[PDB]
Amino acid sequence: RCTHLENRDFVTGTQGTTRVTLVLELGGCVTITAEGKPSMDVWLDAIYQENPAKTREYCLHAKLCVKAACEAKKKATGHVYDANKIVYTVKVEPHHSGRKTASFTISSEKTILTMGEYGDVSLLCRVASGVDLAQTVILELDKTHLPTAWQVHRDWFNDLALPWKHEGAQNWNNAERLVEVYNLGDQTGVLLKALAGVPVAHIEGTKYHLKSGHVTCEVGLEKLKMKGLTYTMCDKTKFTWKRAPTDSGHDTVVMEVTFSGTKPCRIPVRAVAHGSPDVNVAMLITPNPTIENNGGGFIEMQLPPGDNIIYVGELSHQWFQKGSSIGRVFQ
Amino acid sequence: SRCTHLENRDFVTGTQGTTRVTLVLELGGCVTITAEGKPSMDVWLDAIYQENPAKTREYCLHAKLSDTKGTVCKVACVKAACEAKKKATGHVYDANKIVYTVKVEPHRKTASFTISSEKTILTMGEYGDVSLLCRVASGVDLAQTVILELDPTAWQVHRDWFNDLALPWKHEGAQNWNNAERLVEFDVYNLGDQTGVLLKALAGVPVAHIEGTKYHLKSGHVTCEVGLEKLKMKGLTYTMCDKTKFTWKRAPTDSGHDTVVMEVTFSGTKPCRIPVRAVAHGSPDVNVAMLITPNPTIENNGGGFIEMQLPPGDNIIYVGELSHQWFQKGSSIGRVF
Amino acid sequence: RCTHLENRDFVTGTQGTTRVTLVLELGGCVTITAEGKPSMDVWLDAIYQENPAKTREYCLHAKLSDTKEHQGGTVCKACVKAACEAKKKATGHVYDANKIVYTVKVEPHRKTASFTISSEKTILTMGEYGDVSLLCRVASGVDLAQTVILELDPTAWQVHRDWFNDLALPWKHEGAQNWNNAERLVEFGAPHAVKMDVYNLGDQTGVLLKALAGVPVAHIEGTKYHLKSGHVTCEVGLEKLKMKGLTYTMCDKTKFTWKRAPTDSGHDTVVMEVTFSGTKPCRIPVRAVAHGSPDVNVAMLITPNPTIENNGGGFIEMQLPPGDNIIYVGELSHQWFQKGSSIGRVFQ
């Protein structure tokens, strides 16, 4: 599942310093190996924020001149991320055992690790969200056998035509949106209809996970002869679709290919926008798609809106990319 | 050509034959990289855009009404709709969907990057397999931007300005307009077409360059690290241009995207590095010029264009002994509508 | 105070180019030194924006005129003209992330360079070191998109956008002739048939100050709106020079004491100071554990390389996960409770 470090991706100095550049996408692993020392696996294991700030609470079903209240367990709550509080956890392990862990944020970039056999190693990781956090709100329903947490657009959330308040307030704002005597009933159904196909938010306890993002690390090694490899290009005539291009569930395109040639090798990947077959429009999330002796074959990418053609050598598949949207209209 | 040559300081050659090259490519900025016995290659940032950004609020500039009695009420009521082609629509960028297209051509390969897509391998032919790692950087604070477009037709407006626009609004797909009474005064009178009042408020506001579906940005850069193998990289170093031989081709002016642009002519020996700085009137020791142009140079045929950011107030730009006073206006969300 | 550049942090090329990678947090200094040349101190001196854009103005105290309807700037049920009291506004300011300046200073044992998101590269003539290319990637310590500077006529705070936007007070933009939602500071009593009672809710400065308790303060130095969090990551390019390579030994874990026990920095981080009684200079062993696991290090240092120098050192800044944590500085330990995120206290 791990890609090997290539010669081009590291530099060895006259004064014995090795500078390595790793691009680690969520779930992506790179194997770094030095002479006489066991090979180490380096990967981005998680992207999350624990307990993000609660913003507006929307009422889905209004209750009760007497004050308008909300029905029991009938709220839709918003949560906002703090881009500087999101944790990117990098794990280092040989080949559990001598597994090192380092967490980074926008604010915390540098750490010195004692990689045992590789000695004191400097790790400088620049984090990069796969989500435009400024335009995101986590919409969550009250605990009751369905997805009840979504990643919605800020402009959609803020203009939700429902009564609202902040936790601690004892008065609902714009309660006349469900009340007046006129009562409009439970709007959970209308909301769920609008949230169809919208990315679900992975919450594991207090950890609010992100399913997209990477880290670009500058690794500093001292006094060691780094074993560098170079991949040959995979034969374009020996690819098959294990998994044809599909929506990842976080605004990317995922696919998996089968290789029936000599391994390991570099996967030839490109995409063309309809009309121009010369320009490559594939923007890979997978920094180096390869076929390994062990595994390999999974490719993630961004594509322009419209009709595209993905090429994995001579293997092709058309892909229609939908345009951007703040969400479906709610009334 | 405005292509700058790669300098010795901008690359490192390893013991195990690896060359690491750092390029700073601002929109329209080009760098020429050259290897021993191999032809020279031009590397530039060609475009920054997002295709079809998400539609946010639609504002009504001119109310279309029905007969007196999705309604505005006094009791007398009218049905309030919008006039044909009289909307002002908002569009939001997805920072991770903005494409930064890098082109490589001798003296042709294309690679696109986003916040999410940073790495590619490109077969540059005589240079072999080349790893390209580009960190993209918007020249616009995207979180505080809304693209306002009429049915110059488009502008880059501040989010806080857009959100508080005193006009009726709705989202694409909604039947009724919110706050329709903003264009209805009570006998029912219509406040008329507000396009004129809006155009007056949008004066001098940065225009949004829309090329079909491509919503362009005219500000931004990419910082790339280039990995080359088994090749003798040519190392060139620019001498500083003579401070006494500069003259204004185009005196400092607004770029149209919150920067200061200018052009200079050089009468001395070329090519050389342009000496550029600025001082806040009163403080003459501190350099306050923040160049958008990573390496301003005078080329044998070409060079002389300088882009920079400056602090608010009274500044004095220096291109060697050549000087020009520049007044920098402060930040604003926009004019009150 | 200044830490020394380590061997791992720089690479020397075959064609005589040295590439140094510096991480400079606000107030953090790194000493770079070359054989036969004087030492140079490199630090991030300031992070600020001059005159950020003014957004909404909120009224804290209503200036109600004459108690007597189709007019703009009145509250009705009898009608009174509603304006704001003199110097009783709470103004919002938004940063332009691309307009924030990160000033790097270089001095022996003096040159200045300013960077922004948009301006990354500059060439400096470091004198004894010759022409040095400086490429600094700036990084705000504050999520600017979710921040508003709230200032009164302590003067200013960094508040959350969602909190600011939903403030239950009358508002307007500079230049507008009338206040929106002015009825938020007007109260109407039972009518006396010939006259109706009109009350003013009074000055709300007090209620606001109570809600802004513990909220990070905005440091305004004239026109300069400062940030107290953030760093810059610089790629420093040097020519034809023998760069001195130093490597720190690890500090003895048994010789640390608390000069200052873990505390809130005032900008969403944890700060502390330790004293060292062993042989100097050395690298400080710093780690932290959270309730969730005892094996995983959860300390996210703001201080790129905490060291004990001959000339000071011992100050450590870090981010920690929410909840119960235990900070370790060798064998020296201290528990730290980290409060979770919040847009702010409910304002009435």
Residue numbers in the entry:
A (entry chain A): 2 to 65, 116 to 146, 157 to 205, 208 to 243, 254 to 404
B (entry chain C): 1 to 69, 89 to 93, 114 to 146, 160 to 203, 210 to 244, 253 to 403
C (entry chain B): 2 to 69, 85 to 93, 115 to 146, 160 to 203, 210 to 404
Sentences from the paper on this structure:
Flaviviruses enter cells by fusion with endosomal membranes through a rearrangement of the envelope protein E, a class II membrane fusion protein, into fusogenic trimers. The rod‐like E subunits bend into “hairpins” to bring the fusion loops next to the C‐terminal transmembrane (TM) anchors, with the TM‐proximal “stem” element zippering the E trimer to force apposition of the membranes. The E protein is about 500 amino acids (aa) long, with an ectodomain formed by the ~ 400 N‐terminal aa and folded as three β‐sheet rich domains I, II, and III. The ectodomain is followed by a flexible region termed “stem” that tethers it to the C‐terminal transmembrane (TM) helices.
19, which suggested a role for sequence elements in the distal stem in zippering, we designed a recombinant soluble TBEV E protein (sE‐linker) in which an 8‐residue linker (GGGSGGGS) connected Gln404 to Gly427 and the following H3, bypassing most of the proximal stem, i.e., the second half of H1, H2, and the CS. We also introduced the same mutation in the FL (W101H) described in the DENV1 work 19 into the sE‐linker construct (sE‐linker* mutant), to enhance solubility and facilitate trimerization at low pH under crystallization conditions in the absence of detergent. We obtained crystals of the rhombohedral space group H3 diffracting to 2.6 Å resolution. Nevertheless, the density was clear for the stem up to the last residue before the linker (Gln404), which corresponds to Glu403 in DENV1 E —the last residue resolved in that structure 19. As in the DENV1 sE trimer, in the TBEV sE‐linker* structure the stem adopts an extended conformation running within a groove, termed the “αA/B” groove, at the inner surface of domain II of the same chain, formed in between α‐helices A and B and bounded by the 3/10 helical turn η3 (see Appendix Fig S1 for the secondary structure nomenclature).
